[PDB]
Amino acid sequence: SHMEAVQNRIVEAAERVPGVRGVIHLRARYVGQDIWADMIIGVDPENTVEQAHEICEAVQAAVCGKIRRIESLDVSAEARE
Amino acid sequence: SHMEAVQNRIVEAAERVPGVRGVIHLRARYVGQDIWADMIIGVDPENTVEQAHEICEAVQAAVCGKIRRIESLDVSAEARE
Question: Mutating residue 49 to R: what's the consequence (chains A, B)?
Answer without folding.
Answer: Loss of magnetic response, still stabilizes MamB, CTD dimerizes, binds cations, dimer interface is tighter and twisted
